[model samples]
Target chain A: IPETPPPG
Target chain B: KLPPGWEKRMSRSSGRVYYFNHITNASQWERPSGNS
Candidate 1:
């Protein structure tokens, strides 16, 4: 699974 | 921050969740807005 950077 | 804890880690997902964040969220949090 790929890490999703939080929507900044 | 070692997640692994469980599903229902919410306000985040919208569906039947599973177990994984434990390994995912672990060592993940990016510090408070700054300190870079």
Candidate 2:
């Protein structure tokens, strides 16, 4: 998968 | 449906909703506010 900003 | 290729799915561990773009191979925790 592409970068999704890694939801925190 | 949702924002073009975007779709809504539930997280197995957290049981929370997350958004993913099947066409673009993208994922997000929150539903996209806009197409930006």
Candidate 3:
């Protein structure tokens, strides 16, 4: 979840 | 006397006036000094 929410 | 009442000149009286009154409380603290 840390990956910036996959930038969705 | 005057010629009035004999007819219209004076006639109002069987002439007389009357007064009337009533009282409520017979006693009020019965103050010796006569209060109320």
Candidate 4:
């Protein structure tokens, strides 16, 4: 679950 | 704190005081603007 570039 | 994305997301930090964006840094980028 390390691909965390999903919260803006 | 990392960014402003263009789409598809969840809650980012609720806009601080209706933001007139101030300059803060990464690593805290601890200062000569020193270590506050």
Candidate 5:
């Protein structure tokens, strides 16, 4: 499964 | 700035634009890279 994107 | 398969969507609560990657199934707050 793909992981969620991260924030700066 | 944006990349392919990446959409720029707005966050009503945050009052900011978040980047969503369709292919990667990811969402981010900062601007994404131009290539890949």
Candidate 6:
């Protein structure tokens, strides 16, 4: 997920 | 569903923080030694 994993 | 549709992000739980599914679920769920 870490192709920059985070959107919350 | 293998549908890489970040098209609207997780229509379910607190998802898409991408690597933090620390366990518990047979409900179409996620991660750990599920490995990177």
lDDT of candidates 1 onward, in order: 0.33, 0.57, 0.20, 0.23, 0.54, 0.31
Candidate 5 global lDDT: 0.54
Report how large a share of the reference interface contacts model 5 reproduces: 0.05
Question: What is the Cα-based TM-score of model 5?
Answer: 0.47
Better-scoring candidate (DockQ), 1 or 3: 1
List the candidate 6 regions with Cα displacement exceeding 4 Å.
A1-8, B1-11, B16-25, B31-36
Q: Candidate 3's residue-wise lDDT over B1-36, tens digit each? A: 322212111112232211111132121112222232
**Candidates, DockQ:** 0.07, 0.16, 0.00, 0.10, 0.14, 0.08
Q: Rank the candidates by TM-score, best first.
A: 5, 2, 3, 1, 6, 4
Pairs with backbone N, CA or C atoms under 3 Å apart (clashes), candidate 6: none
lDDT of 6 by residue, B1-36 (tens): 433332222324444324332243122223332422
Calculate each model's fnat, 2 decimals.
0.00, 0.05, 0.00, 0.00, 0.05, 0.05
lDDT of 1 at B23: 42
Give one digit per residue, the lDDT tens place, for model 4 in B1-36: 323412222223332112211334112111121223
Across A1-8, the per-residue lDDT of candidate 6 in tens digits comes to 32323333
Write the number of the candidate with greater lDDT, choosing between 1 and 4: 1
Isolated chain B TM-score per model? 0.16, 0.42, 0.17, 0.14, 0.50, 0.12
Q: Candidate 1, what DockQ? A: 0.07
Give me the candidate number with maximum TM-score. 5
In candidate 2, position B20 carries an lDDT of 74
Ranking according to DockQ, highest score first: 2, 5, 4, 6, 1, 3
- Cand. 2 TM to true fold: 0.41
Model 4 stretches astray by more than 4 angstroms? A1-8, B1-6, B15-36
Off by over 4 Å in 2: A1-8, B12-16, B33-36
Give the docking tier of candidate 3. Answer: incorrect
Which 10-residue window of candidate 1 chain B scores lowest in summed lDDT? Answer: B9-18
Superposed by TM-score, candidate 5 places the C-alpha of residue A4 at a distance from the truth, in angstroms, of 14
Question: Per-residue lDDT of B1-36 in model 2, one digit per residue for the tens?
Answer: 447777666555444446777886666666455432
- TM-score per model over all chains: 0.16, 0.41, 0.16, 0.13, 0.47, 0.14
Q: Model 5: DockQ against the native?
A: 0.14
